[PDB]
PDB file of C-alpha atoms in Angstrom:
ATOM      1  CA  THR A 145      -4.783  25.689  -8.171  1.00 27.15           C
ATOM      2  CA  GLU A 146      -7.005  23.047 -10.066  1.00 28.39           C
ATOM      3  CA  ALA A 147      -9.919  22.404  -8.113  1.00 29.16           C
ATOM      4  CA  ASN A 148     -11.361  19.134  -9.021  1.00 29.70           C
ATOM      5  CA  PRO A 149      -8.926  16.254 -10.471  1.00 29.22           C
ATOM      6  CA  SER A 150     -11.480  16.816 -13.381  1.00 29.38           C
ATOM      7  CA  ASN A 151      -9.791  20.049 -14.169  1.00 29.24           C
ATOM      8  CA  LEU A 152      -6.510  18.142 -14.692  1.00 26.49           C
ATOM      9  CA  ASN A 153      -5.495  17.662 -18.216  1.00 28.06           C
ATOM     10  CA  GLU A 154      -5.126  14.088 -19.525  1.00 28.79           C
ATOM     11  CA  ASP A 155      -1.280  13.806 -18.735  1.00 30.36           C
ATOM     12  CA  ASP A 156      -1.136  15.457 -15.120  1.00 33.48           C
ATOM     13  CA  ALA A 157      -4.131  13.407 -14.285  1.00 34.57           C
ATOM     14  CA  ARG A 158      -2.796  10.123 -15.082  1.00 37.09           C
ATOM     15  CA  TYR A 159       0.875  10.510 -14.693  1.00 38.73           C
ATOM     16  CA  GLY A 160       1.286  13.228 -11.723  1.00 43.69           C
ATOM     17  CA  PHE A 161       2.611  17.031 -12.303  1.00 46.36           C
ATOM     18  CA  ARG A 162       5.796  17.812 -13.882  1.00 48.00           C
ATOM     19  CA  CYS A 163       9.077  18.908 -11.577  1.00 47.85           C
ATOM     20  CA  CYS A 164      11.976  20.684 -12.266  1.00 53.80           C
ATOM     21  CA  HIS A 165      15.001  19.238 -13.876  1.00 53.11           C
ATOM     22  CA  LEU A 166      17.873  18.674 -11.800  1.00 52.53           C
ATOM     23  CA  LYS A 167      19.375  21.958 -10.776  1.00 54.01           C
ATOM     24  CA  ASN A 168      22.221  23.342 -13.146  1.00 51.49           C
ATOM     25  CA  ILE A 169      23.058  26.689 -14.867  1.00 49.71           C
ATOM     26  CA  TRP A 170      20.000  26.785 -17.094  1.00 51.80           C
ATOM     27  CA  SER A 171      17.427  25.310 -15.049  1.00 50.49           C
ATOM     28  CA  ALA A 172      18.026  27.298 -11.772  1.00 52.46           C
ATOM     29  CA  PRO A 173      18.290  30.621 -12.711  1.00 54.59           C
ATOM     30  CA  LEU A 174      17.573  33.265 -10.467  1.00 52.73           C
ATOM     31  CA  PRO A 175      14.074  34.130 -10.338  1.00 54.64           C
ATOM     32  CA  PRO A 176      12.813  35.691 -13.566  1.00 57.21           C
ATOM     33  CA  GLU A 177      11.849  38.853 -11.859  1.00 59.77           C
ATOM     34  CA  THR A 178      15.115  39.501 -10.528  1.00 57.53           C
ATOM     35  CA  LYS A 179      16.012  42.796 -10.069  1.00 58.22           C
ATOM     36  CA  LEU A 180      19.093  43.939 -12.551  1.00 56.25           C
ATOM     37  CA  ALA A 181      19.020  47.604 -11.463  1.00 59.01           C
ATOM     38  CA  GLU A 182      16.888  49.974  -8.577  1.00 57.36           C
ATOM     39  CA  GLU A 183      16.349  53.136  -9.271  1.00 58.91           C
ATOM     40  CA  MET A 184      16.854  56.135  -6.749  1.00 60.27           C
ATOM     41  CA  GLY A 185      15.031  59.394  -7.336  1.00 60.79           C
ATOM     42  CA  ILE A 186      17.202  62.775  -6.711  1.00 60.53           C
ATOM     43  CA  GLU A 187      16.392  66.247  -6.752  1.00 60.34           C
ATOM     44  CA  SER A 188      17.172  68.136 -10.001  1.00 58.47           C
ATOM     45  CA  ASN A 189      20.759  69.061  -8.860  1.00 59.51           C
ATOM     46  CA  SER A 190      21.541  67.063  -5.211  1.00 62.02           C
ATOM     47  CA  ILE A 191      21.526  63.446  -3.669  1.00 65.01           C
ATOM     48  CA  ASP A 192      20.570  62.959  -0.074  1.00 62.62           C
ATOM     49  CA  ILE A 193      23.316  60.560   0.645  1.00 63.88           C
ATOM     50  CA  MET A 194      21.657  59.702   3.839  1.00 63.59           C
ATOM     51  CA  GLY A 195      18.532  58.466   1.568  1.00 65.20           C
ATOM     52  CA  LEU A 196      20.652  56.535  -0.699  1.00 66.29           C
ATOM     53  CA  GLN A 197      22.104  54.345   2.415  1.00 64.58           C
ATOM     54  CA  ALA A 198      18.279  53.834   3.056  1.00 64.41           C
ATOM     55  CA  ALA A 199      17.792  52.849  -0.444  1.00 65.45           C
ATOM     56  CA  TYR A 200      20.211  50.183  -0.318  1.00 68.92           C
ATOM     57  CA  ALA A 201      19.100  48.749   2.670  1.00 69.17           C
ATOM     58  CA  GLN A 202      15.616  48.574   1.294  1.00 71.00           C
ATOM     59  CA  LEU A 203      16.958  47.263  -1.552  1.00 69.62           C
ATOM     60  CA  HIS A 204      18.576  44.168   0.290  1.00 69.79           C
ATOM     61  CA  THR A 205      15.571  43.295   2.245  1.00 68.62           C
ATOM     62  CA  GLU A 206      13.736  43.321  -1.093  1.00 67.98           C
ATOM     63  CA  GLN A 207      16.693  40.984  -2.540  1.00 69.86           C
ATOM     64  CA  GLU A 208      17.262  38.475   0.365  1.00 69.94           C
ATOM     65  CA  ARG A 209      13.036  38.132  -0.184  1.00 68.67           C
ATOM     66  CA  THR A 210      13.523  37.294  -3.982  1.00 68.87           C
ATOM     67  CA  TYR A 211      16.406  35.086  -3.895  1.00 69.05           C
ATOM     68  CA  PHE A 212      15.539  33.122  -1.124  1.00 68.15           C
ATOM     69  CA  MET A 213      12.698  34.365   1.325  1.00 71.72           C
ATOM     70  CA  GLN A 214       9.739  33.952  -1.171  1.00 70.12           C
ATOM     71  CA  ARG A 215       7.802  31.712   1.291  1.00 70.90           C
ATOM     72  CA  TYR A 216       6.574  32.981   4.575  1.00 73.94           C
ATOM     73  CA  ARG A 217       8.081  30.472   6.461  1.00 75.96           C
ATOM     74  CA  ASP A 218      11.534  31.299   5.095  1.00 73.69           C
ATOM     75  CA  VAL A 219      10.983  34.632   5.998  1.00 75.80           C
ATOM     76  CA  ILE A 220      10.168  33.901   9.537  1.00 72.45           C
ATOM     77  CA  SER A 221      13.260  31.770   9.835  1.00 70.74           C
ATOM     78  CA  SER A 222      15.219  34.801   8.682  1.00 72.18           C
ATOM     79  CA  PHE A 223      14.306  36.516  11.876  1.00 71.20           C
ATOM     80  CA  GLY A 224      15.495  33.161  13.583  1.00 70.20           C
ATOM     81  CA  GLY A 225      11.955  32.330  14.492  1.00 68.74           C
ATOM     82  CA  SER A 226      10.026  29.573  13.725  1.00 67.80           C
ATOM     83  CA  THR A 227       6.572  28.073  12.482  1.00 69.29           C
ATOM     84  CA  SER A 228       4.346  25.239  12.731  1.00 68.32           C
ATOM     85  CA  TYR A 229       3.343  23.442   9.950  1.00 69.53           C
ATOM     86  CA  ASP A 230       0.186  24.508  10.472  1.00 70.00           C
ATOM     87  CA  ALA A 231       0.994  28.307   9.888  1.00 69.55           C
ATOM     88  CA  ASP A 232       1.226  28.114   6.162  1.00 70.92           C
ATOM     89  CA  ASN A 233      -0.765  24.843   5.629  1.00 72.24           C
ATOM     90  CA  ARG A 234       2.430  22.894   4.620  1.00 74.86           C
ATOM     91  CA  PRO A 235       2.531  19.077   4.213  1.00 76.28           C
ATOM     92  CA  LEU A 236       5.060  17.695   6.800  1.00 78.41           C
ATOM     93  CA  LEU A 237       7.716  15.752   5.052  1.00 79.26           C
ATOM     94  CA  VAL A 238       8.668  12.527   7.357  1.00 79.89           C
ATOM     95  CA  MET A 239      10.867  10.939   5.007  1.00 81.36           C
ATOM     96  CA  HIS A 240      13.280  11.800   2.017  1.00 84.38           C
ATOM     97  CA  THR A 241      15.174   9.014   0.181  1.00 84.76           C
ATOM     98  CA  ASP A 242      17.232   9.307  -2.798  1.00 82.11           C
ATOM     99  CA  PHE A 243      19.349   6.681  -4.768  1.00 82.35           C
ATOM    100  CA  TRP A 244      20.576   5.867  -8.369  1.00 85.08           C
ATOM    101  CA  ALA A 245      18.962   3.524 -11.084  1.00 84.09           C
ATOM    102  CA  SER A 246      21.659   0.902 -12.340  1.00 83.69           C
ATOM    103  CA  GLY A 247      21.293  -2.424 -14.002  1.00 83.23           C
ATOM    104  CA  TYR A 248      22.965  -4.452 -16.573  1.00 81.26           C
ATOM    105  CA  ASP A 249      23.202  -5.095 -20.395  1.00 82.16           C
ATOM    106  CA  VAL A 250      21.489  -7.935 -22.274  1.00 83.62           C
ATOM    107  CA  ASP A 251      23.968  -9.112 -25.039  1.00 84.42           C
ATOM    108  CA  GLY A 252      22.558 -10.307 -28.358  1.00 85.26           C
ATOM    109  CA  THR A 253      23.506 -13.443 -29.923  1.00 87.96           C
ATOM    110  CA  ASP A 254      21.668 -14.302 -32.981  1.00 86.33           C
ATOM    111  CA  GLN A 255      23.278 -13.622 -36.623  1.00 86.67           C
ATOM    112  CA  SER A 256      22.135 -10.326 -36.785  1.00 84.19           C
ATOM    113  CA  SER A 257      21.936  -9.316 -33.141  1.00 85.92           C
ATOM    114  CA  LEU A 258      25.344 -10.762 -32.302  1.00 89.31           C
ATOM    115  CA  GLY A 259      27.212  -7.573 -30.932  1.00 91.19           C
ATOM    116  CA  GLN A 260      24.161  -5.779 -29.933  1.00 92.42           C
ATOM    117  CA  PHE A 261      23.122  -4.709 -26.433  1.00 92.22           C
ATOM    118  CA  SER A 262      20.029  -3.832 -24.628  1.00 91.15           C
ATOM    119  CA  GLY A 263      19.791  -1.951 -21.424  1.00 93.39           C
ATOM    120  CA  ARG A 264      17.865  -3.273 -18.501  1.00 88.66           C
ATOM    121  CA  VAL A 265      17.800  -1.009 -15.600  1.00 92.14           C
ATOM    122  CA  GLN A 266      16.662  -2.927 -12.237  1.00 95.39           C
ATOM    123  CA  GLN A 267      17.439  -1.254  -8.938  1.00 93.31           C
ATOM    124  CA  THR A 268      16.504  -2.703  -5.524  1.00 95.85           C
ATOM    125  CA  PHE A 269      15.837  -0.019  -2.627  1.00 94.45           C
ATOM    126  CA  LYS A 270      14.851   0.623   0.827  1.00 92.06           C
ATOM    127  CA  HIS A 271      12.469   3.588   1.926  1.00 89.10           C
ATOM    128  CA  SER A 272      11.714   3.368   5.496  1.00 89.41           C
ATOM    129  CA  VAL A 273      10.066   5.999   7.720  1.00 89.28           C
ATOM    130  CA  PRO A 274      10.792   6.117  11.308  1.00 90.00           C
ATOM    131  CA  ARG A 275       8.218   5.543  14.019  1.00 86.25           C
ATOM    132  CA  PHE A 276       5.874   8.823  13.595  1.00 87.22           C
ATOM    133  CA  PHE A 277       3.271  10.270  15.552  1.00 87.57           C
ATOM    134  CA  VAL A 278      -0.125  11.264  13.920  1.00 89.08           C
ATOM    135  CA  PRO A 279      -1.505  14.238  15.833  1.00 90.16           C
ATOM    136  CA  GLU A 280      -4.575  14.671  13.784  1.00 91.79           C
ATOM    137  CA  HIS A 281      -6.551  12.464  11.441  1.00 90.26           C
ATOM    138  CA  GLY A 282      -5.283  12.720   7.664  1.00 90.67           C
ATOM    139  CA  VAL A 283      -3.154  10.875   5.076  1.00 90.14           C
ATOM    140  CA  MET A 284       0.397   9.519   4.881  1.00 89.09           C
ATOM    141  CA  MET A 285       1.301   9.689   1.258  1.00 92.37           C
ATOM    142  CA  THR A 286       4.592   8.405  -0.238  1.00 93.16           C
ATOM    143  CA  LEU A 287       5.445   9.523  -3.832  1.00 94.20           C
ATOM    144  CA  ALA A 288       8.451   8.756  -6.288  1.00 91.93           C
TER     145      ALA A 288
ATOM    146  CA  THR B 145     -22.305 -34.155  -2.106  1.00 87.05           C
ATOM    147  CA  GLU B 146     -21.565 -35.493  -5.137  1.00 87.29           C
ATOM    148  CA  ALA B 147     -22.559 -39.175  -4.792  1.00 90.42           C
ATOM    149  CA  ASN B 148     -20.153 -40.390  -7.404  1.00 86.64           C
ATOM    150  CA  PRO B 149     -17.154 -39.086  -9.055  1.00 85.78           C
ATOM    151  CA  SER B 150     -19.490 -39.420 -12.057  1.00 85.09           C
ATOM    152  CA  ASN B 151     -21.634 -36.719 -10.766  1.00 83.05           C
ATOM    153  CA  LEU B 152     -18.916 -34.446 -10.702  1.00 80.31           C
ATOM    154  CA  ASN B 153     -18.422 -31.930 -13.758  1.00 78.69           C
ATOM    155  CA  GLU B 154     -15.699 -32.039 -16.275  1.00 81.65           C
ATOM    156  CA  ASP B 155     -13.546 -29.373 -14.683  1.00 84.84           C
ATOM    157  CA  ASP B 156     -14.175 -30.645 -10.933  1.00 82.54           C
ATOM    158  CA  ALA B 157     -13.297 -34.125 -11.622  1.00 79.82           C
ATOM    159  CA  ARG B 158     -10.080 -33.500 -13.729  1.00 79.36           C
ATOM    160  CA  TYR B 159      -8.653 -30.787 -11.503  1.00 78.44           C
ATOM    161  CA  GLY B 160     -10.316 -30.776  -8.078  1.00 75.79           C
ATOM    162  CA  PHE B 161     -12.653 -28.638  -6.621  1.00 77.47           C
ATOM    163  CA  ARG B 162     -12.105 -24.716  -6.323  1.00 76.22           C
ATOM    164  CA  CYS B 163     -11.088 -23.092  -3.078  1.00 77.09           C
ATOM    165  CA  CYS B 164     -11.768 -19.916  -1.409  1.00 76.32           C
ATOM    166  CA  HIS B 165      -9.220 -17.092  -2.342  1.00 80.02           C
ATOM    167  CA  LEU B 166      -6.802 -15.559   0.221  1.00 80.92           C
ATOM    168  CA  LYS B 167      -8.774 -14.124   2.761  1.00 82.22           C
ATOM    169  CA  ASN B 168      -9.420 -10.291   2.312  1.00 82.03           C
ATOM    170  CA  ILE B 169     -11.963  -7.414   2.704  1.00 84.63           C
ATOM    171  CA  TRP B 170     -13.872  -8.839  -0.018  1.00 84.84           C
ATOM    172  CA  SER B 171     -13.678 -12.533  -0.308  1.00 83.72           C
ATOM    173  CA  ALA B 172     -13.987 -12.999   3.685  1.00 87.32           C
ATOM    174  CA  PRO B 173     -17.035 -11.272   4.203  1.00 87.50           C
ATOM    175  CA  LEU B 174     -19.237 -12.170   7.387  1.00 87.35           C
ATOM    176  CA  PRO B 175     -21.308 -15.108   6.580  1.00 91.42           C
ATOM    177  CA  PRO B 176     -24.003 -13.807   4.078  1.00 91.85           C
ATOM    178  CA  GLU B 177     -27.033 -14.384   6.302  1.00 87.94           C
ATOM    179  CA  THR B 178     -25.394 -12.161   9.405  1.00 90.05           C
ATOM    180  CA  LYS B 179     -27.984 -10.666  11.331  1.00 91.34           C
ATOM    181  CA  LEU B 180     -27.980  -6.547  10.628  1.00 91.24           C
ATOM    182  CA  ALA B 181     -30.755  -6.097  13.350  1.00 89.97           C
ATOM    183  CA  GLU B 182     -32.659  -8.068  15.924  1.00 90.44           C
ATOM    184  CA  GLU B 183     -36.258  -7.690  16.668  1.00 89.49           C
ATOM    185  CA  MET B 184     -38.125  -7.838  19.853  1.00 88.69           C
ATOM    186  CA  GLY B 185     -41.877  -7.655  20.179  1.00 91.01           C
ATOM    187  CA  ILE B 186     -43.233  -5.690  22.630  1.00 87.90           C
ATOM    188  CA  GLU B 187     -46.704  -4.822  24.214  1.00 88.72           C
ATOM    189  CA  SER B 188     -48.394  -1.852  23.036  1.00 89.71           C
ATOM    190  CA  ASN B 189     -47.349   0.740  25.143  1.00 92.22           C
ATOM    191  CA  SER B 190     -44.770  -1.100  27.545  1.00 92.13           C
ATOM    192  CA  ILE B 191     -41.164  -2.996  26.729  1.00 91.08           C
ATOM    193  CA  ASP B 192     -40.341  -5.772  29.276  1.00 90.62           C
ATOM    194  CA  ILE B 193     -36.870  -4.830  30.392  1.00 87.77           C
ATOM    195  CA  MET B 194     -36.035  -8.000  31.737  1.00 86.67           C
ATOM    196  CA  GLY B 195     -36.780  -9.524  28.374  1.00 86.46           C
ATOM    197  CA  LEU B 196     -34.615  -7.212  26.830  1.00 83.63           C
ATOM    198  CA  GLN B 197     -31.974  -8.268  28.740  1.00 82.69           C
ATOM    199  CA  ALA B 198     -32.692 -12.057  27.801  1.00 81.46           C
ATOM    200  CA  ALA B 199     -33.153 -11.004  24.297  1.00 85.18           C
ATOM    201  CA  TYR B 200     -29.951  -9.744  24.023  1.00 83.35           C
ATOM    202  CA  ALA B 201     -28.186 -12.902  25.527  1.00 84.53           C
ATOM    203  CA  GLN B 202     -30.052 -14.984  23.267  1.00 86.96           C
ATOM    204  CA  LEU B 203     -28.774 -13.030  20.430  1.00 89.44           C
ATOM    205  CA  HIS B 204     -25.205 -13.441  21.331  1.00 89.78           C
ATOM    206  CA  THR B 205     -25.583 -17.238  21.360  1.00 92.06           C
ATOM    207  CA  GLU B 206     -26.930 -16.722  17.736  1.00 91.70           C
ATOM    208  CA  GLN B 207     -24.034 -14.175  16.795  1.00 92.91           C
ATOM    209  CA  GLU B 208     -21.352 -16.414  18.210  1.00 92.30           C
ATOM    210  CA  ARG B 209     -22.652 -19.365  16.337  1.00 92.42           C
ATOM    211  CA  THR B 210     -22.908 -17.461  13.161  1.00 95.93           C
ATOM    212  CA  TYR B 211     -19.572 -15.760  13.228  1.00 98.64           C
ATOM    213  CA  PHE B 212     -17.617 -18.828  14.486  1.00 96.41           C
ATOM    214  CA  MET B 213     -19.243 -21.578  15.710  1.00 95.47           C
ATOM    215  CA  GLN B 214     -21.050 -23.043  12.823  1.00 94.25           C
ATOM    216  CA  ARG B 215     -19.392 -26.649  12.693  1.00 93.36           C
ATOM    217  CA  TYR B 216     -20.425 -28.755  15.695  1.00 91.80           C
ATOM    218  CA  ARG B 217     -16.971 -29.310  16.989  1.00 92.52           C
ATOM    219  CA  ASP B 218     -16.468 -25.430  17.561  1.00 96.11           C
ATOM    220  CA  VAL B 219     -19.653 -25.178  19.472  1.00 93.76           C
ATOM    221  CA  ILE B 220     -18.371 -27.857  21.830  1.00 95.00           C
ATOM    222  CA  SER B 221     -14.874 -26.362  21.971  1.00 94.97           C
ATOM    223  CA  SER B 222     -16.631 -23.075  22.993  1.00 96.16           C
ATOM    224  CA  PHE B 223     -17.509 -24.626  26.346  1.00 91.58           C
ATOM    225  CA  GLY B 224     -14.105 -25.604  26.949  1.00 91.24           C
ATOM    226  CA  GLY B 225     -14.773 -29.558  25.933  1.00 95.14           C
ATOM    227  CA  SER B 226     -13.527 -31.239  22.892  1.00 94.24           C
ATOM    228  CA  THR B 227     -14.427 -33.943  20.275  1.00 93.45           C
ATOM    229  CA  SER B 228     -12.838 -36.604  18.722  1.00 94.90           C
ATOM    230  CA  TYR B 229     -12.843 -36.546  14.946  1.00 93.01           C
ATOM    231  CA  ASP B 230     -15.032 -39.533  15.082  1.00 90.49           C
ATOM    232  CA  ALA B 231     -17.652 -37.131  16.316  1.00 93.48           C
ATOM    233  CA  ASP B 232     -18.353 -35.371  13.227  1.00 97.91           C
ATOM    234  CA  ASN B 233     -16.398 -37.647  11.021  1.00 97.96           C
ATOM    235  CA  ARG B 234     -13.964 -35.170  10.085  1.00 96.33           C
ATOM    236  CA  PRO B 235     -10.718 -36.380   8.322  1.00 94.37           C
ATOM    237  CA  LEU B 236      -7.843 -35.750  10.474  1.00 96.36           C
ATOM    238  CA  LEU B 237      -5.372 -33.324   9.482  1.00 98.36           C
ATOM    239  CA  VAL B 238      -1.814 -34.638  10.001  1.00 97.69           C
ATOM    240  CA  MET B 239       0.408 -31.933   8.502  1.00 96.66           C
ATOM    241  CA  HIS B 240       0.110 -28.501   6.919  1.00 96.05           C
ATOM    242  CA  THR B 241       2.553 -26.914   4.884  1.00 95.13           C
ATOM    243  CA  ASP B 242       2.983 -23.646   3.015  1.00 95.66           C
ATOM    244  CA  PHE B 243       5.602 -22.075   0.959  1.00 97.72           C
ATOM    245  CA  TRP B 244       6.041 -19.275  -1.566  1.00 96.07           C
ATOM    246  CA  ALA B 245       6.868 -20.345  -5.352  1.00 95.68           C
ATOM    247  CA  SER B 246       9.518 -18.120  -6.885  1.00 95.86           C
ATOM    248  CA  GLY B 247      11.930 -18.587  -9.917  1.00 96.95           C
ATOM    249  CA  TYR B 248      13.843 -16.848 -12.150  1.00 99.62           C
ATOM    250  CA  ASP B 249      13.610 -14.651 -15.661  1.00103.55           C
ATOM    251  CA  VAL B 250      15.098 -15.977 -18.859  1.00102.83           C
ATOM    252  CA  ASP B 251      16.564 -12.960 -21.037  1.00101.98           C
ATOM    253  CA  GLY B 252      15.500 -12.986 -24.742  1.00101.02           C
ATOM    254  CA  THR B 253      18.554 -12.664 -27.120  1.00 98.13           C
ATOM    255  CA  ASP B 254      17.721 -12.499 -30.726  1.00 99.05           C
ATOM    256  CA  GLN B 255      17.085  -9.368 -32.860  1.00100.79           C
ATOM    257  CA  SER B 256      13.303  -8.776 -31.725  1.00102.51           C
ATOM    258  CA  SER B 257      13.679 -10.796 -28.822  1.00102.48           C
ATOM    259  CA  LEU B 258      16.439  -8.675 -27.110  1.00 98.49           C
ATOM    260  CA  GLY B 259      15.427  -6.909 -23.984  1.00 99.05           C
ATOM    261  CA  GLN B 260      12.131  -9.196 -23.466  1.00 98.87           C
ATOM    262  CA  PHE B 261      11.672 -11.675 -20.519  1.00 99.22           C
ATOM    263  CA  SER B 262       9.852 -14.738 -19.576  1.00 98.39           C
ATOM    264  CA  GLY B 263       9.095 -15.637 -15.991  1.00 97.31           C
ATOM    265  CA  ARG B 264      10.069 -19.457 -15.006  1.00 94.35           C
ATOM    266  CA  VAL B 265       8.876 -20.107 -11.682  1.00 93.69           C
ATOM    267  CA  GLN B 266      10.392 -23.286 -10.135  1.00 89.82           C
ATOM    268  CA  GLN B 267      10.274 -23.860  -6.541  1.00 91.24           C
ATOM    269  CA  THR B 268      11.803 -26.775  -4.396  1.00 91.53           C
ATOM    270  CA  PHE B 269       9.847 -27.811  -1.192  1.00 91.51           C
ATOM    271  CA  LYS B 270       9.658 -30.252   1.418  1.00 91.17           C
ATOM    272  CA  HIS B 271       6.600 -31.518   3.058  1.00 93.12           C
ATOM    273  CA  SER B 272       7.487 -33.897   5.957  1.00 94.40           C
ATOM    274  CA  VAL B 273       4.917 -35.728   8.174  1.00 93.96           C
ATOM    275  CA  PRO B 274       6.200 -37.325  11.256  1.00 94.22           C
ATOM    276  CA  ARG B 275       5.835 -40.802  12.390  1.00 95.29           C
ATOM    277  CA  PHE B 276       1.914 -41.077  12.738  1.00 96.40           C
ATOM    278  CA  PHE B 277       0.098 -43.845  14.266  1.00 97.10           C
ATOM    279  CA  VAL B 278      -2.716 -45.579  12.140  1.00 95.42           C
ATOM    280  CA  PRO B 279      -5.162 -46.796  14.824  1.00 93.60           C
ATOM    281  CA  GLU B 280      -7.712 -48.274  12.193  1.00 96.37           C
ATOM    282  CA  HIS B 281      -7.620 -49.159   8.346  1.00 99.08           C
ATOM    283  CA  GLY B 282      -7.904 -45.974   5.699  1.00 99.52           C
ATOM    284  CA  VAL B 283      -6.097 -43.580   3.516  1.00100.06           C
ATOM    285  CA  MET B 284      -3.313 -41.122   4.054  1.00 97.96           C
ATOM    286  CA  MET B 285      -3.786 -38.661   1.357  1.00 98.18           C
ATOM    287  CA  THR B 286      -2.068 -35.709   0.657  1.00 99.36           C
ATOM    288  CA  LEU B 287      -3.292 -32.726  -1.796  1.00 99.96           C
ATOM    289  CA  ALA B 288      -1.651 -29.633  -3.310  1.00101.14           C
TER     290      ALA B 288
END
């Protein structure tokens, strides 16, 4: 929530924010506040089995939310409904491309560099956005 | 309007005159003397709406001229007429070619140059003038 580009720090402002590593077991853990146990109160000597039933149901709603419905839009999708991008002010994703960056090695050829190599990665790529209709004034930003 | 090659300065005489950068917003501005307002006198308390009408018309001729008819030949074209190249003594353009100059990179291969590159631009090109009839003695100059 920085208010001005001037509230950003050296690195961020010049290179952009940092993003998440590709997903793996250690970089895609369940949200840190994930419940590991759900307590349910009980009268000194008895337990309301009907309440216990509700308790679970309630928990279920809580979990679903924590695990994958943390964003309003996703909760509404949960019900089988939908939301315009104006509903939560989300930028509209118009096109997403992804590709691997490969290249070649350069062979060292002098007395000491003979048998050495330097990797030069150089990948060509196309990123094409199909004719899009702009309903209101604004910006079309493309990032990498 | 230099009179003799000897009136030219070091750089010009050896390398040729300088030309305009490719056209862009900052290198193709409307001629510096472009009108930003056109005044029209008016009697102390009234304005001749008929004059105002003429005033605009007159302005229009002035603008058209400033914007794109600064050369005699272009004004005459404006009327849907034409002018020989002898009319304003303009050199006759016989052929105009244009192309991009690309090349390749040379890979550095020794201990310190390994992983370095040097751009060698080398472009082949054809410039062909179709059989032209020379009506009077003169010169056929080709420049780049």
